[PDB]
Amino acid sequence: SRPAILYALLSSSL
Amino acid sequence: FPTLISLLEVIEPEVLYSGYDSTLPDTSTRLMSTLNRLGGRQVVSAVKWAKALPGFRNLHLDDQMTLLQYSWMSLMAFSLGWRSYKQSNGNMLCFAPDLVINEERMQLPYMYDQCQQMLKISSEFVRLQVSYDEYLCMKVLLLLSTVPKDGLKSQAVFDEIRMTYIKELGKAIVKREGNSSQNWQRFYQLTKLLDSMHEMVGGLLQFCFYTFVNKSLSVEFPEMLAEIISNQLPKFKAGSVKPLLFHQ
Ligand SMILES: C[C@@H]1C[C@H]2[C@@H]3CCC4=CC(=O)C=C[C@]4(C)[C@@]3(F)[C@@H](O)C[C@]2(C)[C@@]1(O)C(=O)CO
Numbered sequence: 001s002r003p004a005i006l007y008a009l010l011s012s013s014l
Numbered sequence: 015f016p017t018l019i020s021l022l023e024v025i026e027p028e029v030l031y032s033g034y035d036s037t038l039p040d041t042s043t044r045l046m047s048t049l050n051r052l053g054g055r056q057v058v059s060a061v062k063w064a065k066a067l068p069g070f071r072n073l074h075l076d077d078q079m080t081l082l083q084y085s086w087m088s089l090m091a092f093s094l095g096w097r098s099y100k101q102s103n104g105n106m107l108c109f110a111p112d113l114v115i116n117e118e119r120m121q122l123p124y125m126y127d128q129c130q131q132m133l134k135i136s137s138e139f140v141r142l143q144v145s146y147d148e149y150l151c152m153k154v155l156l157l158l159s160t161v162p163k164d165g166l167k168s169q170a171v172f173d174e175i176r177m178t179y180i181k182e183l184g185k186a187i188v189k190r191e192g193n194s195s196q197n198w199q200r201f202y203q204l205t206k207l208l209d210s211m212h213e214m215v216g217g218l219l220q221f222c223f224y225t226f227v228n229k230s231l232s233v234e235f236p237e238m239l240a241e242i243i244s245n246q247l248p249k250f251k252a253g254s255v256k257p258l259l260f261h262q
């Protein structure tokens with residue numbers, strides 16, 4: 001599915 | 015108020031060290047694994063770079079994800095080209111200051127073909143004598159040069175960004191030379207280069223997918239890249255990806 005770390009970095013959302 | 019070119023200069027990521035251990039002998043698997051581990055970190059650097067890129071944060075989050083997934087290899091290969099051009103005039107691949115692959119090291123099994131590919135990019139910079147500012151702008155364009163076949167969630171904003179950076183490449187060319195009509199000849203050459211990048215990178219992308227999928231080669235990938243590659247892999251097999259060309 002969707003690439004986790006890249007997503008975490010781009011949203012920054014707690 | 016700071017110029018856009020000067021922002022591009024300040025936000026450019028600093029060259030990473032690989033921390034390769036030159037004590038142990040080189041093997042194909044080890045080298046490729048090291049390069050991938052380095053790539054992982056370089057990509058994280060590129061993401062942080064994108065988030066500070068003027069314009070970029072206005073895109074929809076999903077468009078951000080898309081452009082970075084579609085173009086990470088271009089960004090990395092292009093930077094490699096630049097470093098190789100700057101440090102060795104295109105003679106060696108300068109992955110990191112502590113990891114330089116020269117003529118001799120390329121003779122390893124599997125290495126020769128892939129290295130020949132990456133050197134092509136380098137010699138392009140050599141041929142065209144690209145300047146730093148030209149490079150910085152072209153690099154941004156690469157981020158914005160591959161889109162899904164049925165467009166983006168915020169095509170509005172995308173097209174504006176793309177246009178700003180094209181204009182910027184313009185200023186960079188002018189700054190090298192003045193307002194001659196050789197200026198548009200240069201613009202052609204540099205846009206021709208940007209175009210030829212889809213083919214060159216496509217080559218690298220193929221080796222990457224091959225070494226990722228074919229477990230018997232024992233090449234390792236860090237989680238960052240693995241997640242991205244495995245998501246991006248079906249999308250490329252299904253040819254659902256569209257290059258934006260400047261030419262015919
Ligand atoms: C030929 C391909 C293209 C290679 C990439 C070329 C671009 C790049 C620039 C770097 O400064 C370091 C890592 C990367 C991002 C890379 F060098 C490695 O990841 C290994 C890589 C995918 C490859 O060598 C392999 O698939 C071997 O695993």
Ligand SMILES: C[As](C)(=O)[O-]
Nearest residue numbers: 027028059062063
């Ligand atoms: C914060 As950096 C210079 O690793 O992109």
